[PDB]
Amino acid sequence: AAADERSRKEMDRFQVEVQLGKEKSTGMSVAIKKVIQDPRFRNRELQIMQDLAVLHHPNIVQLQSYFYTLGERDRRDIYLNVVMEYVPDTLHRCCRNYYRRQVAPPPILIKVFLFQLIRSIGCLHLPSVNVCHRDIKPHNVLVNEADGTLKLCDFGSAKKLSPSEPNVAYICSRYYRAPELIFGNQHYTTAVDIWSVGCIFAEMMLGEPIFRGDNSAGQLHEIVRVLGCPSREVLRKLNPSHTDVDLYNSKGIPWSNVFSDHSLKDAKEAYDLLSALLQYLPEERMKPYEALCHPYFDELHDPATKLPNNKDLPEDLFRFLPNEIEVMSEAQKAKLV
Amino acid sequence: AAADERSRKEMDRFQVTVQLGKEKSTGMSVAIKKVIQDPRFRNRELQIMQDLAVLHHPNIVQLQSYFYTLGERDRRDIYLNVVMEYVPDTLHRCCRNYYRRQVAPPPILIKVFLFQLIRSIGCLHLPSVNVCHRDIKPHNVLVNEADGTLKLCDFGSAKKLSPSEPNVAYICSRYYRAPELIFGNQHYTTAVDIWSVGCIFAEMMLGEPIFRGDNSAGQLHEIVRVLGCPSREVLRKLNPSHTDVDLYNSKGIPWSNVFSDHSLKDAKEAYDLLSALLQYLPEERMKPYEALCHPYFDELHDPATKLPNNKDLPEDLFRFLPNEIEVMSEAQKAKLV
């Protein structure tokens, strides 16, 4: 198994039940991702996780350790094993448990979860940090339902994007894939994560994915079917070779008909925020710290606001790291800090 | 760097990301493809070429030899080397040479080339052979203008398809991908090659690829732009989750407007045949042995018809293997044999 004395030491720090287990020491639950080491390459996930660990964000899962081990089909091969803090409940499971009983998760949970998801990408997207997750989805969001807390996980598709280097599109799970990724742009921005988060929002309020393509063509279909035909500007910028507006022909479906079986007291606020996140044009998608100040979240500031079991809102909800505060506008610092 | 004595002996029959050389023995030009051997797996391509070599169809390249060599990046790794007959001109090069000079290829050449290309897939698709090439494009067709012959090559992406085992799509080069492949059907038929051939026919008359998508969605966009909105049946049968026809608000473009710049006037027979092959529904695409009887090929039956260089038409143009004659209908046998 172990390929190193250091790796053997780190392995013995944990007990196993991706592999799930617990830190024998502190009792903390952990998951172990195992990925091949290629002599030619260094692993991005590890470095990303190590950069993030220095910040220790309340809404991002924390690296515990890494260690190496040999292969089975070939003992020549070395495998990196990354160990992250973990919890068994995902946003997907959490939401599915309500919808399976023909009800929806409490509005305030939906609201507190979203605020924290927006928070996770706010920090990731900082110039200082510059991590693009590239596969934000309900299976990759961990939640504590009772505490109202939430953490972004699985950076196995993450990359720090740069202008000077091009990128693939297929790493993002299809239903959560931004339009620029559907069009196969080798260069895109962290706005692909904003799209993903807008798709989860819709998903929390619908009980299924909003854009469920059986394929790339189908994925575009489902987006166009709801958001309507994209503008000339959009197609010209994101899909220059195929700008024929009559082959993207729909008026769209308003949010009121999308969310027909489920009601919110502040539907117009939620739909505003949802629309701002699901803008076709990347630079026009609302950026995390602006989203956190949107009216949909106003009630989270009210000290009378509590969780569905009448418990207080999570401690850290408004505990922002200096890193974040430094980049905020004055108006954002006024509202959030 | 042979892997055994058989491989050393075979390697020395010939002299030199493929490798071009000649068979010392007969002077015959050859191509040498090398592909990794994996111990878990058998190579489909070799077995396919070995099966086809038995038939020795005049329009399929013929396997000459196979040998194994050890790696350079790793001497532990064995590589299969497949040696097949080769000629310097691809159908792609041949047409490029005309369209380079703002000139269309000779109509009789296009005609005689299509007959033979349609002939090859007719053989591949016999139930007794049941080979699907899966990447028919002009780079994979070899021609000799001097005698008018054509050979289908590069069975690198080929497979004997069956309903018991699902298949991938990405193997077929994008521009030549049938609609069922763009939709990601895991199960499809040999008709995916009838489409590819249809795409090459159109390319022979246009001087560039007919459907040029920058992405999977874009590839459908370009097909729809020309063929018009697919029927509800088409979407029902190939893309069951995305059947809203309103999104594809296109009447198509007639072939006479597509091939504007190199107007022919045996055109109505050619456009009729093109439309017969480029059908959305796989099952509706004209089958090779029917396509060979189309009126467009009537000229090839006249002993007075000649290649542009005044040489007789290919000797084996109407020499069909018994393999083929047993499958033919009486109407087909009547016109062809």
UniProtKB/TrEMBL annotation, chain B:
Ranges of residues in domain Protein kinase: 14-297
Domain of life: Eukaryota
S-adenosyl-L-methionine found in the keyword field: no
CDD domains, per database record: STKc_GSK3
One of the Pfam families matching this protein, by short name: Pkinase
Enzyme Commission number, as recorded: 2.7.11.1
InterPro entries the UniProt entry points to: GSK-3 (IPR050591), Kinase-like_dom_sf (IPR011009), Prot_kinase_dom (IPR000719), Ser/Thr_kinase_AS (IPR008271), STKc_GSK3 (IPR039192)
GO molecular function: ATP binding; protein serine/threonine kinase activity
Coiled coil (UniProt feature): none
PROSITE patterns: PROTEIN_KINASE_DOM, PROTEIN_KINASE_ST
Gene Ontology, cellular component aspect: ciliary plasm; ciliary tip; cytoplasm; nuclear lumen; nucleus
Keyword Transferase carried by entry: yes
GO biological process: cell differentiation; signal transduction
Keywords, in A-Z order: ATP-binding, Kinase, Nucleotide-binding, Serine/threonine-protein kinase, Transferase
The family this protein is said to belong to: Belongs to the protein kinase superfamily. CMGC Ser/Thr protein kinase family. GSK-3 subfamily.
Protein name per UniProt: Putative glycogen synthase kinase
Organism of origin: Leishmania major
